[PDB]
Design a protein around this motif. Sequence first.
Motif, short mmCIF file in Angstrom:
data_model
loop_
_atom_site.label_atom_id
_atom_site.label_comp_id
_atom_site.label_asym_id
_atom_site.label_seq_id
_atom_site.Cartn_x
_atom_site.Cartn_y
_atom_site.Cartn_z
N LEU C 144 -35.15 19.31 2.45
CA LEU C 144 -36.18 18.37 2.05
C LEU C 144 -36.96 18.91 0.86
CD1 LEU C 144 -37.47 17.44 5.60
CD2 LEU C 144 -36.37 15.85 4.04
N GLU C 145 -37.41 18.00 0.01
CA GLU C 145 -38.28 18.37 -1.11
C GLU C 145 -39.42 17.36 -1.18
OE1 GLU C 145 -36.88 20.79 -3.82
OE2 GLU C 145 -34.72 20.41 -3.73
N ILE C 146 -40.14 17.38 -2.30
CA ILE C 146 -41.29 16.52 -2.53
C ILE C 146 -40.82 15.31 -3.32
CG2 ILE C 146 -43.71 16.53 -3.14
CD1 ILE C 146 -43.53 19.54 -3.54
N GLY C 147 -40.88 14.13 -2.71
CA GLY C 147 -41.37 13.96 -1.36
C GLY C 147 -40.31 13.34 -0.46
N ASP C 148 -39.46 14.18 0.10
CA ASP C 148 -38.42 13.68 0.97
C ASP C 148 -38.92 13.64 2.40
OD1 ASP C 148 -37.13 13.74 -1.41
OD2 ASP C 148 -35.51 15.09 -0.80
N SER C 149 -38.15 12.97 3.26
CA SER C 149 -38.62 12.71 4.61
C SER C 149 -37.43 12.61 5.55
CB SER C 149 -39.46 11.43 4.68
OG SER C 149 -38.68 10.28 4.39
N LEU C 150 -37.72 12.79 6.83
CA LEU C 150 -36.77 12.61 7.92
C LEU C 150 -37.26 11.49 8.82
CD1 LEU C 150 -34.94 14.69 7.02
CD2 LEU C 150 -35.86 16.27 8.70
#
Lengths: 53, 110, 203, 141, 69, 181, 116
Positions: C144-150
């Motif tokens: 994940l990075e900015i702005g990744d999500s689960l």
Amino acid sequence: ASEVRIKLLLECTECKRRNYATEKNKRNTPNKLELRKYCPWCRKHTVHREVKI
Amino acid sequence: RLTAYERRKFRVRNRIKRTGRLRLSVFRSLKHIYAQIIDDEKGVTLVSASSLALKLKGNKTEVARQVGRALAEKALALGIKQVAFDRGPYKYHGRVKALAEGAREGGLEF
Amino acid sequence: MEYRLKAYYREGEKPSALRRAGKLPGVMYNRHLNRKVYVDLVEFDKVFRQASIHHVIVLELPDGQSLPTLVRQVNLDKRRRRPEHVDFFVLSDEPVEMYVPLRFVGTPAGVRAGGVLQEIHRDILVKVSPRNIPEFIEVDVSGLEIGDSLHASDLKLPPGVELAVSPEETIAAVVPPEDVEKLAEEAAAEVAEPEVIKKGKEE
Amino acid sequence: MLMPRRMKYRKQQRGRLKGATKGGDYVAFGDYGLVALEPAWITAQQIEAARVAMVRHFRRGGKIFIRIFPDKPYTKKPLEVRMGKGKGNVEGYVAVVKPGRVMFEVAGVTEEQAMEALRIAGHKLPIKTKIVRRDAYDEAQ
Amino acid sequence: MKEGIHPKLVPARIICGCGNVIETYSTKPEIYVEVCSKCHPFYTGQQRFVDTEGRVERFQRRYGDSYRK
Amino acid sequence: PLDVALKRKYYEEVRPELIRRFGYQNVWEVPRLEKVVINQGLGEAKEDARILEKAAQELALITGQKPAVTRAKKSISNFKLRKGMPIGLRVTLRRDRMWIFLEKLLNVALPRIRDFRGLNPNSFDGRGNYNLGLREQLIFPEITYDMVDALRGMDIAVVTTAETDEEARALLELLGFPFRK
Amino acid sequence: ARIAGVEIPRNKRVDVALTYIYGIGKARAKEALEKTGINPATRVKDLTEAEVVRLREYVENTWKLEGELRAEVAANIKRLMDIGCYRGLRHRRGLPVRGQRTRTNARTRKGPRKTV
RNA sequence: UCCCCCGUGCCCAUAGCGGCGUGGAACCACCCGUUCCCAUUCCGAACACGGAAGUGAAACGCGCCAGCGCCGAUGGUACUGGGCGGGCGACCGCCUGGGAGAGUAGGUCGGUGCGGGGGA
RNA sequence: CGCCUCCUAAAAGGUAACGGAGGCGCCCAAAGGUCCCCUCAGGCGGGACGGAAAUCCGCCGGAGAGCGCAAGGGUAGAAGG
RNA sequence: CUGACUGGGGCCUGUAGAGCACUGAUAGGGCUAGGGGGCCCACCAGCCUACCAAACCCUGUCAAACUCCGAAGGGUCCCAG
Ligand SMILES: NC(=[NH2+])NCCC[C@H](N)C(=O)O
Ligand SMILES: [Mg+2]
Ligand SMILES: [Mg+2]
Ligand SMILES: [Mg+2]
Ligand SMILES: [Mg+2]
Ligand SMILES: [Mg+2]
Ligand SMILES: [Mg+2]
Ligand SMILES: [Mg+2]
Ligand SMILES: [Mg+2]
Ligand SMILES: [Mg+2]
Ligand SMILES: [Mg+2]
Ligand SMILES: [Mg+2]
Ligand SMILES: [Mg+2]
Ligand SMILES: [Mg+2]
Ligand SMILES: [Mg+2]
Ligand SMILES: [Mg+2]
Ligand SMILES: [Mg+2]
Ligand SMILES: [Mg+2]
Ligand SMILES: [Mg+2]
Ligand SMILES: [Mg+2]
Ligand SMILES: [Mg+2]
Ligand SMILES: [Mg+2]
Ligand SMILES: [Mg+2]
Ligand SMILES: [Mg+2]
Ligand SMILES: [Mg+2]
Ligand SMILES: [Mg+2]
Ligand SMILES: [Mg+2]
Ligand SMILES: [Mg+2]
Ligand SMILES: [Mg+2]
Ligand SMILES: [Mg+2]
Ligand SMILES: [Mg+2]
Ligand SMILES: [Mg+2]
Ligand SMILES: [Mg+2]
Ligand SMILES: [Mg+2]
Ligand SMILES: [Mg+2]
Ligand SMILES: [Mg+2]
Ligand SMILES: [Mg+2]
Ligand SMILES: [Mg+2]
Ligand SMILES: [Mg+2]
Ligand SMILES: [Mg+2]
Ligand SMILES: [Mg+2]
Ligand SMILES: [Mg+2]
Ligand SMILES: [Mg+2]
Ligand SMILES: [Mg+2]
Ligand SMILES: [Mg+2]
Ligand SMILES: [Mg+2]
Ligand SMILES: [Mg+2]
Ligand SMILES: [Mg+2]
Ligand SMILES: [Mg+2]
Ligand SMILES: [Mg+2]
Ligand SMILES: [Mg+2]
Ligand SMILES: [Mg+2]
Ligand SMILES: [Mg+2]
Ligand SMILES: [Mg+2]
Ligand SMILES: [Mg+2]
Ligand SMILES: [Mg+2]
Ligand SMILES: [Mg+2]
Ligand SMILES: [Mg+2]
Ligand SMILES: [Mg+2]
Ligand SMILES: [Mg+2]
Ligand SMILES: [Mg+2]
Ligand SMILES: [Mg+2]
Ligand SMILES: [Mg+2]
Ligand SMILES: [Mg+2]
Ligand SMILES: [Mg+2]
Ligand SMILES: [Mg+2]
Ligand SMILES: [Mg+2]
Ligand SMILES: [Mg+2]
Ligand SMILES: [Mg+2]
Ligand SMILES: [Mg+2]
Ligand SMILES: [Mg+2]
Ligand SMILES: [Mg+2]
Ligand SMILES: [Mg+2]
Ligand SMILES: [Mg+2]
Ligand SMILES: [Mg+2]
Ligand SMILES: [Mg+2]
Ligand SMILES: [Mg+2]
Ligand SMILES: [Zn+2]
Ligand SMILES: [Zn+2]
């Protein structure tokens, strides 16, 4: 009541006595109102015509 | 979600019930016509009549007319005289109107 | 693990009396039973911080019974920030909805970039037989990075345990950090003064 | 700074400050919170001061959560006037805050960093505060 | 049907240019046309009126091959 | 009812191929035509020449049915629109007149369309109904160039009992609806 | 709207009304009437319906016309614009394509004079 | 008195949305027609009439599913009538009687009156 | 400065301040009586000119529309068309 | 004997508290029109955004003129002291 929306009398067409007072918009209803109303002197319904107040 | 049929049924029947009279309710199918007189305060049917009951013949209009007199015939024998005609979702016309005219021919006061 | 807790029955004691005897008022129920209980407050706390609402507590009831329960509800004193009542849900052999911890595995790259792992859910609500509670549910957040999500859709679940929240529900996200080098722009930020909402012939 | 984008009414009556918090009483987002120990109207300037102090201590890193919003318009008559002749002019906005509230939470930071930033934040606020850690009681909420 | 407002439909003889007679109904008892489904290029498969071409470009030029090799 | 080639073609040739192509188990499940709706969305005869009766007399010839007025539900500044203003026509063709109109449409009208490529196959309701447009009215055999003045088209709704596009495409194409693709 | 997609005027001779169809000039007018043996001077009014369908059939089937003529001639211009050839560059600007000078005039492809 | 259907009410979603399945002898729909009474700001769609080949496809009725919707304790808390204390205050406590809302357990894919048609 | 609506008003009614917010000084011959029929806004999909929005068709949609004008109450089982 | 007050019983209420279902507010996240920015293009479309962000949702909240809820009490009638 305003200048356009006048007060008026209803006169029994038969015996000629005014029996009712009402109002109309003489720009919307420019013609003399004719209304069957009960006249208490004739003691029957009669056409009444708008007559100046 | 109500239909025009359901709103109509409700509307005419709400005004009838306001008057508080016994209501001559009429149901009309593609084949038969049914009529019962109803005390809405006790929520109970008082006397019934149908083309399906008396096993009446053919032309739906004259058939409805005869179920009307028949409804009347038993009606007056039970003390019923005055009543209110419940056309429900039906226009006062033809079959439903024939049942009314026959019910009045019997001596139902409405 | 599986934790234990002495519990006792109550009838007409007042809660305030119990709570000044250092006892935490409670209730036990399921579709068959309902009993007013209490549990010594110091002993309960030491159990609850280890065994939140995920792991099982078995209540050693004073009648010799020992019943397997999950804590279903903890009422706190909003003023004093202290437990004031517990719901003990007595388990049976049939399934159950419960919360199971999320154990976030790995180090996000957008976190290495300076970001912050925002863990929206630390547990997930999941229907599962009681003979079958997982300790947790690992989650790989390393990519994940900015702005990744689960989301709960990305939840890889162990056997015999089914998701009981909508898989479209976000569970983790990686946001940008707090940064002072934004202050000056936020401080020199003119604000249009509030607007009343027009009433009357104006709307 | 924080204030309603728009409102149905320009002027709220003053109201009371009795009782414990309605809600917002459990750590719901971050790892540590700043809890209010007594009631007050918290002004926007106070809230902003407490925020800036927390980002300035964090230098770069961490995430600040602000869980109070100043939506109550605060009014004051112009100086040296008498009473009467209508309500004073809105001069600011405040967040009603009652015992139990969690005004701010923090995440993404060492314990010493949250304990310290939250301490500095408390000093900016017109009330007493405690620093709380996200508990299992908080999770159970 | 309401009466007085509706133009009567009567048996009608349509005639297209390709000698097609349609035994339909209309308000004009006998109408002509210049086209019909029994002759339109889209309908009649691909009676590609003119340019069943191949293009013929952009390689069909081939005037010519006499350049050396 | 009247003997019409289309209506006859529905029952004899289109009905059994549909049963074939889908395997219905009731006779009423097979797609049927319910109605065709025509609507000149005029909007030009608002405060202009409100004698749009020219088109009413036009559609009455095309359908054999006198269309009914459509009036605006609200005033609209930019359309010069006031509430209640007449802005078009609609006529609901069913049964024999629906069949007779579709017959000439698929036979005569569609071919006369300028540079006819066929009907837009992606215009199916999603619910198994179909709608097409028209840019002229001379497209029909009953409108001769002499008697016409301005150029008005119409919107067409062909409603079907079929629940899906896939079923409705089969009914209409089997009836003779020329699709481009 | 008879032939051929258009409605050629009456009150005029066929040959000259046939010009009022995109794709037919004076030449293709006296190459149609001769092939189907209709006097060129005959007025469109006085056309026999058999004469008409013979006039329709020849022109509608031997020559690309109306829509389809406009169709390709666009693709001809479309393809020049796409292969990046110098005739296409003059199309992608609206500039004269056949060598003419552009310092002055060229008002047909440019339109009226955009002031400055 | 027991089941099925058709009327017509009462309670007022524990009665609804959705999904599935089922019913045509009877009844009810659709249906078949538009001569006739009646009807369409156009349309026999609706309303209406005369019918009886067909179909339970639509609608209706009946079961079944808890995804939604609706209902929802117990316990504890807020608040509080009345009685008392404390604080400079913002405010905070105690006694007695009352006692939420949220949420939790959990419930629900309706219940019943009257008359009519059929079934044992 | 009279009158209407809401709040302040402490769950009957009433209740003040140069307290917080808006309106009225008209209008309608139908916008009135009665009988009959009808049902919205909105969202998705589809349709020449035609668009965010004109008219048309389908599906969903208990009332968020409408009720001449402020606001509140009321309201489709109509007070709406 | 009807009174203050009190017992029991019915009906009326929308405050305290709470709530977010409506009207508004609201921090963040998810999602996802419209914009701003960047590659690429003017040949009409694309691709990327730690940019502002509608609507939807989620977590969490606010309201005298918000209420899906809603007390204690209060009012009033009957019978009784
Ligand atoms: N039992 C009562 N009526 N209590 C009313 C409130 C009493 C007191 N002010 C308190 O906060 O505790
Ligand atoms: Mg019928
Ligand atoms: Mg402790
Ligand atoms: Mg004050
Ligand atoms: Mg202050
Ligand atoms: Mg002040
Ligand atoms: Mg003042
Ligand atoms: Mg002031
Ligand atoms: Mg201030
Ligand atoms: Mg607070
Ligand atoms: Mg301080
Ligand atoms: Mg059939
Ligand atoms: Mg499509
Ligand atoms: Mg369909
Ligand atoms: Mg024609
Ligand atoms: Mg030409
Ligand atoms: Mg029944
Ligand atoms: Mg079913
Ligand atoms: Mg079946
Ligand atoms: Mg049968
Ligand atoms: Mg059978
Ligand atoms: Mg006739
Ligand atoms: Mg006859
Ligand atoms: Mg007639
Ligand atoms: Mg019919
Ligand atoms: Mg028959
Ligand atoms: Mg069925
Ligand atoms: Mg029905
Ligand atoms: Mg309830
Ligand atoms: Mg509850
Ligand atoms: Mg309780
Ligand atoms: Mg007190
Ligand atoms: Mg207290
Ligand atoms: Mg107490
Ligand atoms: Mg008590
Ligand atoms: Mg309460
Ligand atoms: Mg409750
Ligand atoms: Mg909560
Ligand atoms: Mg069950
Ligand atoms: Mg249910
Ligand atoms: Mg159902
Ligand atoms: Mg019942
Ligand atoms: Mg009863
Ligand atoms: Mg029975
Ligand atoms: Mg005054
Ligand atoms: Mg009040
Ligand atoms: Mg009051
Ligand atoms: Mg009051
Ligand atoms: Mg009071
Ligand atoms: Mg009084
Ligand atoms: Mg004053
Ligand atoms: Mg004023
Ligand atoms: Mg009128
Ligand atoms: Mg009225
Ligand atoms: Mg709509
Ligand atoms: Mg559209
Ligand atoms: Mg449109
Ligand atoms: Mg278009
Ligand atoms: Mg409204
Ligand atoms: Mg106004
Ligand atoms: Mg006494
Ligand atoms: Mg007394
Ligand atoms: Mg007394
Ligand atoms: Mg008393
Ligand atoms: Mg309130
Ligand atoms: Mg309050
Ligand atoms: Mg809200
Ligand atoms: Mg909520
Ligand atoms: Mg408040
Ligand atoms: Mg509140
Ligand atoms: Mg209030
Ligand atoms: Mg409730
Ligand atoms: Mg009470
Ligand atoms: Mg009392
Ligand atoms: Mg008193
Ligand atoms: Mg009392
Ligand atoms: Mg006494
Ligand atoms: Zn007289
Ligand atoms: Zn032909």
